[PDB]
Amino acid sequence: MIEETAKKVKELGFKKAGLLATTGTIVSGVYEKEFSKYGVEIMTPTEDEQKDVMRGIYEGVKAGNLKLGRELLLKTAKILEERGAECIIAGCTEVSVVLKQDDLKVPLIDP
Ligand SMILES: [Ca+2]
DSSP, X not given: OXXXXXXXXXXXXXXXXXXXXXXXXXXXXXHHXXXXXXXXXXXOOOHHHHHHHHIIIIIIIITTOHHHHHHHHHHHXXXXXXXXXXXXXXXXXXXXXXXXXXXXXXXXXXX
């Protein structure tokens, strides 16, 4: 659950979490909402970067082009990280397929 992820992130003392998920999810703003209830901030990529996250999930992972998915998702995760994310949230299972903890400096958490 999004709310359980939020409490866990808060319990780890993190104030800023990076999010890799679908545009539908980011537009609903459900993560920012649930995380705000625990005082935690959600970091999302720019609108163009978000399009590449979408490509990474669908044109990449879901389509079978695992190389492309890894490339685009890893790059986005590394960008959120470099920007200050204390943890990266794998919002879609496709993210966890090509992105693993050994790829990041910060915790990779999935629902
Ligand atoms: Ca690895």
